Design a protein around this ligand. Sequence first.
Ligand SMILES: Cc1cc2nc3c(=O)[nH]c(=O)nc-3n(C[C@H](O)[C@H](O)[C@H](O)COP(=O)(O)OP(=O)(O)OC[C@H]3O[C@@H](n4cnc5c(N)ncnc54)[C@H](O)[C@@H]3O)c2cc1C
Ligand SMILES: Cc1cc2nc3c(=O)[nH]c(=O)nc-3n(C[C@H](O)[C@H](O)[C@H](O)COP(=O)(O)OP(=O)(O)OC[C@H]3O[C@@H](n4cnc5c(N)ncnc54)[C@H](O)[C@@H]3O)c2cc1C
Ligand SMILES: Cc1cc2nc3c(=O)[nH]c(=O)nc-3n(C[C@H](O)[C@H](O)[C@H](O)COP(=O)(O)OP(=O)(O)OC[C@H]3O[C@@H](n4cnc5c(N)ncnc54)[C@H](O)[C@@H]3O)c2cc1C
Ligand SMILES: Cc1cc2nc3c(=O)[nH]c(=O)nc-3n(C[C@H](O)[C@H](O)[C@H](O)COP(=O)(O)OP(=O)(O)OC[C@H]3O[C@@H](n4cnc5c(N)ncnc54)[C@H](O)[C@@H]3O)c2cc1C
Ligand SMILES: O=c1ccn([C@H]2C[C@H](O)[C@@H](COP(=O)(O)O)O2)c(=O)[nH]1
Ligand SMILES: O=c1ccn([C@H]2C[C@H](O)[C@@H](COP(=O)(O)O)O2)c(=O)[nH]1
Ligand SMILES: O=c1ccn([C@H]2C[C@H](O)[C@@H](COP(=O)(O)O)O2)c(=O)[nH]1
Ligand SMILES: O=c1ccn([C@H]2C[C@H](O)[C@@H](COP(=O)(O)O)O2)c(=O)[nH]1
Lengths: 220, 218, 212, 214
Amino acid sequence: HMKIDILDKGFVELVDVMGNDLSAVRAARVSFDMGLKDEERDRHLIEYLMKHGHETPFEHIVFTFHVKAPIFVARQWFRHRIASYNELAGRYSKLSYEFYIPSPERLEGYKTTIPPERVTEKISEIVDKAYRTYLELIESGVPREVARIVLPLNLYTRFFWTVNARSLMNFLNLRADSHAQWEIQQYALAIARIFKEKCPWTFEAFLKYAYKGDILKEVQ
Amino acid sequence: HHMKIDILDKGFVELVDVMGNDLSAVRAARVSFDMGLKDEERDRHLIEYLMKHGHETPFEHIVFTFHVKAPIFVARQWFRHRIASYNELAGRYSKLSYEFYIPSPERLEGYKTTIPPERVTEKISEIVDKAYRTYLELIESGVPREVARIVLPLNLYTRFFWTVNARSLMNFLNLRADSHAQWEIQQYALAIARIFKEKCPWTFEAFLKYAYKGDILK
Amino acid sequence: MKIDILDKGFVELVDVMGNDLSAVRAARVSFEERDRHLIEYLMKHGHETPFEHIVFTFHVKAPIFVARQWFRHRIASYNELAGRYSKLSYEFYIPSPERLEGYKTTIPPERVTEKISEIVDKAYRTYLELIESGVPREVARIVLPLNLYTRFFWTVNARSLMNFLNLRADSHAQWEIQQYALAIARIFKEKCPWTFEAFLKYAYKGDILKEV
Amino acid sequence: MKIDILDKGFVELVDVMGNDLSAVRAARVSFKDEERDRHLIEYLMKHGHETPFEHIVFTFHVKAPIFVARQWFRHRIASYNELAGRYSKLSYEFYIPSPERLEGYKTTIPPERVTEKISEIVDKAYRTYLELIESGVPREVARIVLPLNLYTRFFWTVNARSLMNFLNLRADSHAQWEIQQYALAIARIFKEKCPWTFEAFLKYAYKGDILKEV
Ligand SMILES: Cc1cc2nc3c(=O)[nH]c(=O)nc-3n(C[C@H](O)[C@H](O)[C@H](O)COP(=O)(O)OP(=O)(O)OC[C@H]3O[C@@H](n4cnc5c(N)ncnc54)[C@H](O)[C@@H]3O)c2cc1C
Ligand SMILES: Cc1cc2nc3c(=O)[nH]c(=O)nc-3n(C[C@H](O)[C@H](O)[C@H](O)COP(=O)(O)OP(=O)(O)OC[C@H]3O[C@@H](n4cnc5c(N)ncnc54)[C@H](O)[C@@H]3O)c2cc1C
Ligand SMILES: Cc1cc2nc3c(=O)[nH]c(=O)nc-3n(C[C@H](O)[C@H](O)[C@H](O)COP(=O)(O)OP(=O)(O)OC[C@H]3O[C@@H](n4cnc5c(N)ncnc54)[C@H](O)[C@@H]3O)c2cc1C
Ligand SMILES: Cc1cc2nc3c(=O)[nH]c(=O)nc-3n(C[C@H](O)[C@H](O)[C@H](O)COP(=O)(O)OP(=O)(O)OC[C@H]3O[C@@H](n4cnc5c(N)ncnc54)[C@H](O)[C@@H]3O)c2cc1C
Ligand SMILES: O=c1ccn([C@H]2C[C@H](O)[C@@H](COP(=O)(O)O)O2)c(=O)[nH]1
Ligand SMILES: O=c1ccn([C@H]2C[C@H](O)[C@@H](COP(=O)(O)O)O2)c(=O)[nH]1
Ligand SMILES: O=c1ccn([C@H]2C[C@H](O)[C@@H](COP(=O)(O)O)O2)c(=O)[nH]1
Ligand SMILES: O=c1ccn([C@H]2C[C@H](O)[C@@H](COP(=O)(O)O)O2)c(=O)[nH]1
């Protein structure tokens, strides 16, 4: 399965896809009592739909992703309501020692009082302390669902995300953009790469006509 | 895959595409416990479990695309299911074909009518024909299609694509594969159920057994 | 508040939750010049979720063909009059001759109008005959034309209502639903003048609300 | 109406559109008569005709710990606006369970010590957070060390149908105790503004176990 590594331990992996660029063409064409034509006319229809704001045809393309991301990223991500999610449960599972530790380069462009290496160090220290406490509470008989509340927001979680191309393009608009947090931008770049490989005509037409973000026009 | 079931006199339900299968639900559900697939026994059991306890979100990862040909009055009820995606034939843009649902005499079974059921059938096809011929005359006269079509009756056939996940599809079946629904949409719901059963047999069997609220599938 | 649309149609406001300050409170997560400024700011920058906390209920009487276009807006709630159960009323949208202005037609506009009324009358008379014969209503009604009036309750938040106005208060939309959209817009402006003003200025994608 | 929940939490009613009669008006499609209107409400609820209840809408203002909010926010048929850790300096407010939260569980240390241990890490994480901020580290990065029991605040706009689903699932002994407590608050307010719908819900549609016992 197409699998892209993000951050220090994160990833985005394509589990499944229904349909392709031509799923959008077939759906749009029914309006005119038509179906598919030639490659040239069909690709141009996709561009036509994107340039004029016909978004519903792209709902017939659907993806399922498997994502590992820090909780603070997942919290932003799961704000996208037009999608389906299933997530690893801190209530039911003993959580693994896996946390996002920013690299020193993460603080490029910020004048900092202490070296970036020290920032990285201080984050790690809280992480180890919290995790040790989490395991101590569990070992003492403290229910998992309570023990986990001391764990920090950089804890990695895992989830399945099923989402259609229209909602995926909203996601890219809002998250593949320099206003979203850098961490989620990185995940959105991987989503974009998988989308482009499966639906190249829709992706290129989106970038050309419909996409509102900045970064995907800059970064291949 | 590809499945097609003819419904009423001229209608159909055709499966255009599917994403996932019963194991798609098993995998999504198992992530909760930091697990994946296991054996057929334990995974079939899990699907029954999910269905018994009303854990419906794992089934959203199973997705269907249907191509449907149905009368407008059927489509009108169907399109009330908002948790799904639609694209439909446009009267504003297309010259509409002479295809209308004409009930068969048997459709009045159990109804004592003043005129022979065959006559009811006849009367329906007569009005449909008059309406259609008026539509064509207006079109030939240069009336925009979006206006001409307003004289067309509710038994005109339309066509649409429907993308829907297994959870919404189970909701559709609870409501439409039921005696209280109109017989015509029941028939479409029966075809949707047959296709669902074929592609997701474990989910369907568990649905019938533990969650399905209607009366016609059982 | 009620606006008559078409020959027999209308849009009336049944209820509303909130005003422009509802979006301001949601955006700030708490609880006059700076508050209007925040509304324009949110609108200019595409921050739409705060407008979801303003909600309207409309009662709408409209031809079925208009309602079918309308009910494609999935992010909203609907309850509609039942034709399976209710004997349906003799009310149909008959276009005025002026509806065909611009179109060079082989039949005079007034004659097209007349041809539509005729079908409506014959269709309704067939429906009534069937019901009289003991044909169930849910079957008898299938002969009724797409211009039959129906009524529905529509509950929709301001964000989805702005999406509706972007698509339907626009010259690409069918003229008949444009008229309805103009009415919805007028009510929206009454209740949420700051949001409506900023919407027009910064976010609205249609054309007719800039002209009318 | 504002109800305190947990140690620093609350559920506050901000607005409401409609009342029980809004569902009746929608069901009948008509812009009253108590017994026949209550009877309709019960009929709809009994036969699962739930769409008329979507025309009653609530706005709440809720203060809750992030681990509770993450569960809450899985309810997609609703609208949310939340205090932003990326843009605001976060307040020293964290949920620390009472010893009675863990009484019942046989634990190897006193519950009192479980409280102390939890409080200790909270305090350490918060201190590091403030240090990093003071150092010039972006808020968005500095906050990643804060634990899941940090309090957040959001506006929630939800219709009565979706709110009844939320009660089915959360006002229930399988939901985490913390979110149960919020659900009881939501239910009390819903009962106050929509008494006939709430009664009919309990009698016919409610699938949980706590609201019939409390
Ligand atoms: C840079 C940035 C900063 C942000 N800051 C904050 C913040 O400070 N606080 C905060 O709470 N959130 C914040 N968000 C989250 C934001 O408010 C949205 O919750 C999130 O981006 C999901 O957007 P969406 O509603 O467009 O997507 P979805 O929820 O997936 O919805 C997709 C589309 O369907 C529609 N839709 C779905 N449900 C509804 C509905 N109930 N009503 C009307 N339309 C609906 C809309 O058209 C929407 O575009 C931020 C997002 C970004 C990118
Ligand atoms: C005790 C308990 C344990 C849980 N454990 C986990 C877990 O381990 N992992 C995990 O990921 N989640 C878990 N959840 C969350 C659960 O999976 C749902 O996300 C949550 O209950 C919201 O439910 P909902 O979909 O009914 O509500 P909403 O998202 O508000 O949706 C409301 C209704 O609309 C429908 N609906 C909305 N969107 C769609 C859609 N895209 N497709 C089909 N139908 C739709 C359904 O009819 C649904 O009832 C748990 C919840 C409870 C109460
Ligand atoms: C026998 C029968 C008779 C009917 N008679 C009438 C009638 O007389 N008049 C009429 O108007 N309709 C009528 N309907 C339609 C009915 O009211 C629903 O519109 C239709 O059945 C769709 O059901 P749904 O809302 O559950 O499905 P969807 O709209 O697909 O929604 C699926 C699920 O998601 C949820 N959901 C989706 N959107 C929202 C939302 N905005 N708020 C809260 N929850 C949401 C609900 O949990 C719902 O079960 C009838 C249906 C049947 C089967
Ligand atoms: C001029 C014109 C011509 C049209 N022609 C046709 C035609 O020929 N055939 C046809 O079938 N329809 C046609 N439509 C209808 C159109 O495709 C939409 O169904 C309708 O405009 C509703 O728009 P919407 O989905 O944005 O609104 P809603 O359905 O209310 O949704 C609101 C927003 O939330 C989002 N959303 C809701 N559900 C989903 C979802 N399941 N997946 C992804 N995002 C979602 C999107 O952000 C959407 O903008 C036409 C509309 C217009 C204005
Ligand atoms: O009772 C529960 C358990 C889990 N989840 C959802 C919320 C999170 O998105 C994810 C894991 O939650 P926790 O188990 O970590 O609380 O699944 C809930 O919504 N309710
Ligand atoms: O069995 C039914 C009856 C009604 N409706 C909805 C669809 C329409 O929007 C409206 C009226 O439908 P008819 O009763 O006219 O079919 O209510 C259904 O979905 N199913
Ligand atoms: O302007 C339009 C054209 C089409 N449709 C949708 C509504 C119907 O579901 C279908 C066909 O509509 P008509 O063209 O026949 O109105 O496409 C709209 O919503 N608006
Ligand atoms: O860039 C952002 C900022 C905020 N939020 C949402 C997610 C949370 O529900 C809430 C606060 O997020 P934080 O700012 O704390 O990350 O707003 C986002 O979705 N994206």
